[PDB]
Each structure stands twice: as C-alpha cells, then as structure tokens.
Amino acid sequence: QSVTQLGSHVSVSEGALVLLRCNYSSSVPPYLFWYVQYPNQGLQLLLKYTSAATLVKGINGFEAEFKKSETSFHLTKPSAHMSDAAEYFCAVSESPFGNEKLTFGTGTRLTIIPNIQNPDPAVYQLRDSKSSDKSVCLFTDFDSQTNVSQSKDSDVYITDKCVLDMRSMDFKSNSAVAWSNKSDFACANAFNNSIIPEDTF
Amino acid sequence: VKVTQSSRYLVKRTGEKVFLECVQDMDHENMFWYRQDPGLGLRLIYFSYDVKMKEKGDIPEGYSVSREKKERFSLILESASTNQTSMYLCASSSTGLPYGYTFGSGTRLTVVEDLNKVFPPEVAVFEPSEAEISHTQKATLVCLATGFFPDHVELSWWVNGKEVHSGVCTDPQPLKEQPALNDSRYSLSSRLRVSATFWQNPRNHFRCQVQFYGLSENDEWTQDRAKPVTQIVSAEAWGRA
C-alpha cells in the first residue's frame, strides 16, 4: 500500500557497512522484497520473504530484518564490495509471492569508494599522434580522498573520477579525463582544485 | 522465461503519439508498465490482470494502454512531451505461480522539440603517455566520444577482437559540451589500462567500440547530414615498440 527509502544516494568505503533504508505502510498484511539494478537495464530479486522467519538472507551477501514493530525492512551487508555498486529498490505487495501489484520505493543508488593503498597521483598528456590538433589529459592514481572540480572555461571539459580494476594484478586506480580545443592550454594547468604538491608531470 | 520489450532505446518528437510493446512466453495473466526516473524510483503507469483488461496505475495521466492477446501489453503515449522522457519498464507475473514478477530490460524514450538536434558520436582513442609507462609500467588508453544526441551510447573495449571487462571504466554519466543550451550535445569518456608489456606488443589490437541509438529507418529528414540512425562508431589502436 506504500513504501519509502530514506536516502537516495549512499557512498561507502570498500569493506565498510552497507545500510539501505526501507519502511512501509499497509492496510493489509504486508510482504516485502528488495531488487537491485545494474548497468544491465532490468531489476532483479535480491531477496524476499515468506513468513517462515524474520531475519532474511539475500543474494550477493545481503540481509534484511522484517521488524513489524518498526514498520521496516532495512537492507544490510557487513562489508561492502565494489560490485555492490548499483541501484536498490524496496517493494511491498499484498500477495505473499509478489504476484499482484508491487509498489516500489524511490530507490537508493549505492556508491562504493575504493581503498587506494599506495597512491601516487600523476597528470599525463596523451594523444593519438594522428588525431589532428587533438590530445587529452589524464589525472590518475589519486587516493580516494581526492575530488575533481568542474571547469571554469568554455573550452575546457573535465570528467569526474571513475575507478578501474585490473583483476589480474589485484590493482585498482581512480582516473579523470580533461581536454580543450583551445590550443593555448596544456595539461600542466587543467586541474587546479583539491590537487596535491606530490604530482608527477 | 523471457519478458521482451520491442525496443531497447527510442527517439521521438514532441506532440507525437507513441507505441511500446511487451511480450511474454509464460502464459501470464498480469502485465505491468512502469517508468523509472531519477529520485522517483518506479512508478506504475497502467496494469492488466487478464486479456482485454486494464486498470490505471499511480500515474496513468497522458497514457493509454491496450491488452489484446494474453501474451502482449502495449503502452501508448497520448502526445509526447519532455516529461515523458524516461526508462519504460514492462513486467509480467502469474496469479497462481509463486514466482512474482519477471521484468523485461527496458526501453529508454527521449522526446525532443526539434528533430534536427540529434547527432551520432565521433570517437577517438588516445595512446598511453610514455611517462605513465616509465613511471608506473602500466598503459592507459583513453576513449572519447563527442557530439552525440540524445544521451544514447554504449561504449565497449575489445582486445584482439574479444570484449574485456577488466582494467576498464567509463563515465557513469556524460557531460554537456555547451551547458547553457537547452538541448546541448553530450560527451563521454572511457579508460582501458593494461600492463606496459602488453601495450608494447604490436600483435595486440585495442578497439574502442561505441554503440549509438538514434533514428530508425521509418523516421524522416532532409538535412544534408547523414541520417543519425542506430550504428556502431569505433576507433582502433595497435600495440607499440
């Protein structure tokens, strides 16, 4: 009959606790379910329950307690993993199998922050030597503490940070791209903000 | 056990009536059309509990619906406007089976006021900095996609003609090339990193592949530019000595 998810965006460190709020209202006996959505467009069942018990385990290491006292079904996982980064949806149904219409919450986007161990931030300038005029800047290998600011110049475009995982080398690295069509601009000064004295060039 | 929607992305114009299909191989009574928006979660537009049946959802407004045969449910937009641009999600279920919903995988509909505004991306790869290679013994290629509209791209790397999901990451969102302009074009970047040795093996082929979803063969225009249809725009690179 109704659901809400307080907090629409949660960012937590790798290995830190995940909590994703859900609370419900129902004139009739309620049944709840959690879904998760990735870059892969459709939602998928994370967990549900029959009333065979109150603490429920889900897929991908998750858990939720049905506290009827509290009108809640909060989702938790003791220790966050990078692949938990996704969007999550709490739902309530009148059917105990969720067959007949579900009402969904507003969702909570979950963002995991990587743990960069031996950072060494640097700014590199790349090209495709046969790209005419054009070349790009790559700020990479910065701690998770670091944040990239928006641009202050019509021709200077700068992306946000993004993490990659070379699983073969148990190696993660953050990275952010910048470029401009203004030929009077170099990588040397593109990123100016939240930027460290220990940068290679 | 598939729920399959007729299209994954679609572009359409303001004022226009629009039709979306959904099909299911499970003999299911129930079908549901939702949309999904940022901060609003999922919101039920319309639903059907049997052939020929319908009931209004939480937000039926500007929407009509049709269930005709038991396996398919259609959503109809009465007259497109920008606030019907969204991700459209079909689902089915059966009243007897104990399995709940099966969802399809969605169609993204963007609506626009002016059809000459839609463009395909141009795509470039940038080669590792020798500095990076020297300092870190890894090699980060950058892939860049620019001049695209609407926000409909899927970018993937392929090493030696084989898709990779390791050492990669792409901007979760695009950014506005001309952020004042109401209908500004977009840019997206991606990154593929490998060991410097691998990059220094000219056997190895790296290809950035962008997939763009624009106009269909049905739609019309006579602008001098190529019809900005659905298409894959790539760029390539060879390992180095």
Numbering used by the authors:
A (entry chain A): 1 to 201
B (entry chain B): 2 to 242
What does the primary publication say about this deposited structure?
The key molecular interface that enables T-cells to sense these threats is mediated by the clonally expressed T cell receptor (TCR) that classically distinguishes between self and foreign peptides. The finger-like CDR loops of the TCR are thought to meld around specific pMHCs, sampling the peptide cargo, and enabling T-cell triggering by ligands with sufficient affinity/dwell-time.
For the HA1.7 TCR, we observed a larger shift in potential positions for the Cα backbone of the CDR3α loop, differing by up to 5 Å. In both cases, these shifts were comparable to loop movements reported in several other studies in which the unbound and pMHC-bound TCRs were compared. In contrast, the HA1.7 TCR structures, in which a large loop movement was observed, were solved at 2.5 Å average resolution. However, there was clear density supporting both conformations in the HA1.7 TCR structures. Similarly, the HA1.7 TCR CDR3α loop was free from crystal lattice contacts and shifted between structures. However, several other loops in both the F11 and HA1.7 TCR structures were also free from crystal lattice contacts and did not shift between structures. However, we observed several CDR loop re-organizations between structures for the HA1.7 and F11 TCRs, while all structures of the 003 TCR were identical at the level of the Cα backbone. Although this analysis is an approximation and should be treated as such, the average maximal loop motion was slightly less (6.4 Å) for the 003 TCR compared to F11 (8.7 Å) and HA1.7 (9.0 Å), consistent with the structural data demonstrating greater rigidity in the 003 TCR.
